[PDB]
Write a protein that binds this ligand. Structure first.
Ligand SMILES: [Zn+2]
Ligand SMILES: [Zn+2]
Lengths: 67, 115, 82, 260, 152, 151, 148, 167, 44, 62
């Protein structure tokens, strides 16, 4: 639902790159160039950022249980 | 339900010996070293160091089961030598090699950070 | 039936071996005397197999014939293959 | 019958990785060093969580697992701390553990990013790597107005054999014989394969001529750090840990030999 | 089909008189498989006297006790002398060949198609090979086996 | 749940007693996927094992007398062959002739019948794999294979 | 001495049927002193052999220069004088077949000894006079050296 | 060669003569056999019922063995002949073609309890009640139902203690 | 002679081992041997 | 969805059904595994009469 912390394969930290990745994408980067800007050179970490679906943004459309 | 704790690969159970030496009766001057809570990391280096000893006739290791956490190292030496002595010398040589490698890596790091 | 002429095989069948070993192992487990010597065996099955190899199981196999008669063979009288 | 005399040559040293070469050592020694980089170099990581309040959309184990994987600077503290197995204290103490606290509440209308910057420690030396004084902070959870996350973590000493969260590496590239001279690989079509970065061959030549008398020497390493330890600290701690494994093994060996 | 077959044959069993009988004690087979042998121990073999011609059968199975030098190559000196001199032995070998020829005709009426592949208990060629290797038989030297000993 | 039933199963239904089936007088279990592809690759003619590799493999022989066999190649460098190690795996002194699946049908007629160019024509003698590439035909569930002859 | 056969051979062909294995090559050779054909499987990876080469082949029952049997077991820590010191390529195998042109009545004029060096096959065929040392299921050594 | 005419030449070799054979789509074995220039010795059929009606119980035994073997081996498989022989003897040991069905298996004198195990449980037990049939408990099904040791394998004999050998 | 005598003994022992054992449920065994291959052969 | 932890099951003298005093059916009922007709036929072919009696008499509903 949320960006993983580490790459499943190598263990590189990708948790701090989702927001930067999105900011680069709205900056008219291609996904490949964006992944290059964040330093994801192994295709495992590129897999992590490139195949992520941010479902938490949809789960935050529901009001919480307590106000 | 059946997951062993992850520390069981590294930690010795109470009353369990780290290493056990058993005489191999098939051939003379051979021993089996059953080392608990170790894996290929030490087995491979100990075996390969023992292969550098010309007085060692056989040096092999196996992890009998990956789900279990022991290794067995079989060492056969020449009659004038001993498998226990060979194993001891192999560990001593590995320790000296790693000490030298550590000191040289410290020197290389110092050179790289300095210039 | 004339015991002087028994027509059945002189070999112990696999089923005879199985049941004789199981029976004797139960007898040993129920504190029956052992007929062979023992080094350190405590499993009744091992003791029963040792007794069978030694040919010292005190059991008689009563093999029934289709006509209704029977033939009694001592476990020591049969040829143990396996 | 005696030890190798390995030499070392570091070809790159940054804060992110160390690229070096070990020569005149056995392949087993090189691979055990490589394995210890991953599995027997201790670091500090969150291994105990107490959720006092979690109104977020991720359940408690999700947050706990996520906190465990945040790297914590472990450089000089990991050698000093003890394993909780070895500590003579109760569940915790400052000699075997580091206390973290996290307390965030989304009161404002925009989504609140609970990041690793919100992990407040009692020890200034052991902090989240991203929080160390660029790279953004690791995201623990996004909160909506009215959602709240309050927890209390304890970080422990461990290595990658127990859990990958105690693995300090973000990839260990290991290579040897870049030109296939030992023929430990057999390419069906050697021309089809790209050249290693460490290759020394002219482009017409696909692989080196076969070396019948050759042995694996000159192992190339690129140890990338997740952040907890410096890459050179990972390598030094790996060598020290392997040497102490061998020393303990020799001690137990001596007790077994003399007891016989 | 499996259930039907099982319920039809479930109680058929080999009895201690070696007959195969059902629960009613009726006789289904006087010997199991017509040969009283279990199916685990049997194996594929070849009948060597089925396919060959009369000339080839004669040449391969008729012991030739007239060729002195051939016997000298195959057998040792005392065996050669006994085989060439004695006529009782020669008659024994002649009747051996006649018995094999009768067996040949019996096989020819059993297997009207020339298929020598048969399933039999003991793999005699493999046992012969085992004996050759266990006792280090030299195929190039004359043997000390009397053909009368083979027949008997 | 009893010694009698335990003895029954141990003497009748144990898997080694179940290797050959009465259905078709052949083995019911044989060597299977990875072990079969690998034994085919292992018994090829150009498989040469080094001293350390050979000792590694001999660690996994339960029925090993502890004697390292004399390597098939002594010089310029000691090398054992895959057939030389499978010979140690093969039990007893069994004798077996088979043919690898790629055995050409016109090879048993011409010359080279007993020295096969393709290393087909499996020949095991006295429990040593004298020659040939092992495969389904030699280690599978068919009749007359090495596993059958071993049983 | 322990030598069953010795001669100088000349590589007349390599892999007539084509390369079957990558690291192994079949040599069809003929000598001059005895007129014996040879088929030999050699590991060309470690001991390459080119067409037209000329080598000395020595089938021996033992490696020790003095008559002394071998145990068939690998003893690398052996300091005795071995005749493998005088050769480049050495293999160790067993004779698994001896054919001939014998008849039911005549002995063999030509023999054909087959040896297997752990799967690397050799056939040495020629006059039966030169192959009396060969007996089936007997261990031998190759002892082969290249010469100019 | 399975349909060719295999003869033995005067020299003693097996020779496969390549001859014309006819395959019909129906069966009148009774009539076709009695036709001029038709071989009344090798002409056969795959309809085992007609073989039983024309040639008899042993002829249908052999033919049924042949047809089952053809069904089993057509896919290259192989089954030990004793299994086919036992199945074919079961279907022919009572002089008629005993189908492997309730109409052939529950019509023999196997005992009501064995029959109820297979099929027609209620009809079989009701027939046995109406006729006072007695099951002698000879088969394995009957003993299995009563929880007794089946006379099968390890149950086909008795064990006695040897008093003279316990010494 | 030694090889032939050993061969005779081996043939005798293996033949006596191939004899069917009283108590073999050859009927159930045959039903299984004929029904197991039936599960592989084609329906159409 | 098929995780082993939702499938692993064992029994040793658990609850029994009311009508026939045999083990229950299912993991959820702590039931026993069915020793069916085909298992009976297999063990008849094996010749294991005491094991067959144990499974069909003594381990089910004595
Ligand atoms: Zn990665
Ligand atoms: Zn503490």
């Amino acid at each position: 639902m949320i960006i993983p912390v580490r790459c499943f394969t190598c263990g590189k930290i990708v948790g701090n790159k989702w927001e930067a990745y999105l900011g680069l994408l709205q900056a008219e980067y291609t996904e490949g160039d964006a992944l290059d800007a964040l330093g994801l050179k192994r295709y495992c970490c590129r897999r992590m950022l490139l195949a992520h679906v941010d479902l938490i943004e949809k789960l935050l459309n529901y009001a919480p249980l307590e106000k | 339900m059946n997951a062993p704790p992850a520390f069981e690969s590294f930690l010795l159970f109470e009353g369990e010996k780290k290493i056990t030496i058993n005489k191999d009766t098939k051939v003379p001057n051979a021993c089996l070293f059953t080392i608990n809570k170790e894996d290929h990391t030490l087995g491979n280096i100990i075996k390969s160091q023992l292969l550098k000893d010309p007085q060692v006739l056989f040096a092999g290791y196996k992890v009998p089961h990956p789900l279990e956490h022991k290794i067995i190292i079989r060492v056969q030496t020449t009659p004038d030598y001993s498998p226990q002595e060979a194993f001891t010398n192999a560990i001593t040589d590995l320790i000296s090699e790693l000490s030298l490698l550590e000191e040289r890596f410290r020197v290389a790091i110092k050179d790289k950070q300095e210039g | 039936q004339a015991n002087q002429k028994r027509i059945t095989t002189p070999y112990m069948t696999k089923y005879e071996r199985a049941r004789v070993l199981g029976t004797r192992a139960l007898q040993i487990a129920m504190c029956a005397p052992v007929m062979v010597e023992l080094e350190g065996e405590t499993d009744p099955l091992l003791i029963a197999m040792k007794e069978l190899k030694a040919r010292k199981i005190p059991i008689i196999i009563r093999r029934y014939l289709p006509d209704g008669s029977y033939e009694d063979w001592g476990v020591d009288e049969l040829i143990i293959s396996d | 019958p005696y030890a190798n005399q390995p030499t070392v040559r570091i070809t790159e040293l940054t804060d992110e990785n160390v690229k070096f070469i070990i020569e005149n050592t056995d392949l087993a020694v090189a691979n055990s060093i490589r394995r210890v980089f991953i599995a027997e170099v201790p670091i500090i990581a969150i291994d105990w969580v107490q959720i006092d309040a979690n109104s977020s959309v991720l359940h408690d184990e999700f947050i706990a697992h996520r906190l465990g994987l945040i790297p914590l600077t472990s450089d000089d503290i990991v050698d000093k701390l003890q394993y909780s197995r070895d500590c003579t204290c109760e569940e915790f103490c400052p000699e075997c553990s580091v206390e973290f606290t996290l307390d965030v509440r989304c009161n404002e209308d925009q989504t609140r990013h609970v990041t690793s910057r919100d992990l407040i420690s009692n020890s200034p030396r052991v902090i989240p790597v991203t929080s160390r004084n660029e790279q953004d902070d690791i995201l623990i959870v996004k909160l909506r107005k009215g959602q709240e996350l309050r927890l209390r973590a304890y970080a422990k000493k461990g290595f990658g054999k127990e859990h990958a969260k105690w693995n300090p590496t973000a990839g260990v590239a290991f290579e040897y014989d870049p030109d296939n001279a030992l023929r430990h690989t057999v390419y069906p079509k050697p021309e089809e394969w790209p050249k290693s970065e460490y290759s020394e061959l002219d482009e017409d030549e696909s692989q080196a001529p076969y070396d019948p008398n050759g042995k694996p020497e000159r192992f190339y390493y690129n140890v990338e750090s997740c952040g907890s330890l410096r890459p050179e600290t990972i390598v030094l701690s790996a060598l020290s840990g392997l040497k102490k494994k061998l020393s303990d093994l020799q001690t137990q060996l001596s007790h077994e030999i003399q007891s016989d | 089909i499996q259930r039907r077959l099982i319920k039809s044959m479930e109680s058929v069993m080999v009895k201690y008189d070696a007959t195969v009988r059902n629960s009613i004690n009726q006789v289904v087979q006087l010997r199991y498989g017509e040969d009283g042998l279990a199916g685990e121990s049997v194996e594929f073999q070849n009948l060597a006297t089925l396919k060959p011609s009369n000339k080839a059968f004669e040449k391969k199975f008729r012991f030739d006790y007239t060729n002195e030098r051939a016997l000298r190559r195959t057998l040792q000196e005392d065996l050669v002398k006994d085989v060439l001199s004695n006529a009782h032995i020669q008659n024994e070998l002649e009747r051996e060949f006649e018995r094999m020829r009768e067996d040949r005709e019996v096989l020819r009426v059993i297997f009207p198609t020339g298929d020598s592949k048969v399933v039999l208990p003991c793999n005699l060629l493999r046992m012969i090979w085992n004996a050759q290797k266990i006792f280090h038989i030299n195929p190039r030297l004359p043997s000390d086996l009397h053909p009368i000993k083979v027949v008997e | 749940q009893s010694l009698e039933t335990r003895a029954e199963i141990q003497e009748l239904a144990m898997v080694p007693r179940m290797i050959v089936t009465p259905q078709s007088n052949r083995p019911v279990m044989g060597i299977v996927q990875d072990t079969l592809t690998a034994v085919r690759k292992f018994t090829k003619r150009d498989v040469f094992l080094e001293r350390g590799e050979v000792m590694n493999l001999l660690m996994f022989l339960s029925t090993w007398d502890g004697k390292v066999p004399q390597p098939a190649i002594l010089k310029p460098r000691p090398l054992w062959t895959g057939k030389q190690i499978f010979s140690l795996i093969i039990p007893g002194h069994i004798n077996c002739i088979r043919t690898h699946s790629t055995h050409p049908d016109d090879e048993d007629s011409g010359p080279y019948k007993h020295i096969s160019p393709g290393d087909t024509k499996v020949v095991v003698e006295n429990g040593e794999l004298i020659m040939g590439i092992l495969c389904k035909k030699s280690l599978g569930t068919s009749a007359g294979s090495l596993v059958h002859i071993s049983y | 001495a322990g030598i069953l056969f010795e001669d100088i051979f000349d590589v007349k062909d390599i892999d007539p049927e084509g390369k079957k294995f990558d690291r192994v090559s079949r040599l069809h050779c003929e000598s001059e002193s005895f007129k014996m054909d040879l088929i030999l499987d050699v590991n060309i990876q470690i001991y390459p052999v080119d067409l037209g080469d000329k080598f000395r082949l020595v089938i021996a029952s033992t490696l020790y220069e003095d008559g002394t049997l071998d145990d068939g077991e690998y003893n690398p820590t052996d300091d005795r004088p071995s005749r493998a010191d005088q050769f480049e390529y050495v293999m160790y195998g067993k004779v698994y077949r001896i054919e001939g042109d014998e008849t039911s009545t005549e002995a063999a004029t030509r023999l054909s000894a087959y040896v297997s060096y752990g799967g690397l096959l050799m056939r040495l065929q020629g006059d039966a006079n030169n192959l009396h040392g060969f007996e089936v299921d007997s261990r031998v050594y190759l002892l082969m050296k290249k010469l100019a | 060669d399975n349909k060719k005419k295999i003869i033995i030449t005067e020299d003693g070799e097996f020779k496969a003569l390549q001859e014309w054979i006819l395959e019909t789509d129906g069966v009148s074995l009774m009539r076709v056999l009695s036709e001029k220039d038709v071989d009344p010795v090798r002409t056969t059929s795959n309809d085992i019922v007609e073989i039983f009606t024309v040639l008899g119980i042993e002829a249908v035994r052999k033919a049924l063995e042949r047809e089952l073997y053809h069904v089993i081996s057509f896919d290259g498989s192989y089954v030990n002949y004793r299994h086919l022989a036992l199945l074919c003897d079961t279907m022919t040991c009572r002089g008629h073609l005993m189908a492997i069905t309730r109409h052939g298996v529950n019509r023999q004198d196997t005992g009501p309890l064995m029959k109820c195990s297979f099929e027609e449980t209620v009809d079989v037990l009701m027939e046995a009640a109406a006729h006072g049939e007695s099951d002698p408990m000879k088969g394995v099904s009957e003993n299995i139902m009563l929880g007794q040791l089946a006379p099968a394998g390890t149950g086909c004999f008795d064990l006695l203690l040897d008093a003279e050998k316990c010494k | 002679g030694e090889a032939f005598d050993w061969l005779l003994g081996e043939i005798e022992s293996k033949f006596n081992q191939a004899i069917a054992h009283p108590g073999e449920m050859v009927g159930a065994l045959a039903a299984q041997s004929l029904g197991e291959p039936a599960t592989q052969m084609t329906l159409n | 969805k098929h995780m082993v932890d939702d499938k692993i099951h064992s029994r040793a003298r658990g609850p029994i059904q009311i009508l026939n005093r045999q083990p229950m059916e299912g993991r959820s009922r702590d039931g026993g595994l069915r020793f069916g007709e085909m298992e009976r036929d297999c063990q008849i072919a094996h010749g294991a009469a005491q094991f067959l009696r144990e499974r069909l008499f003594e381990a089910s509903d004595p």
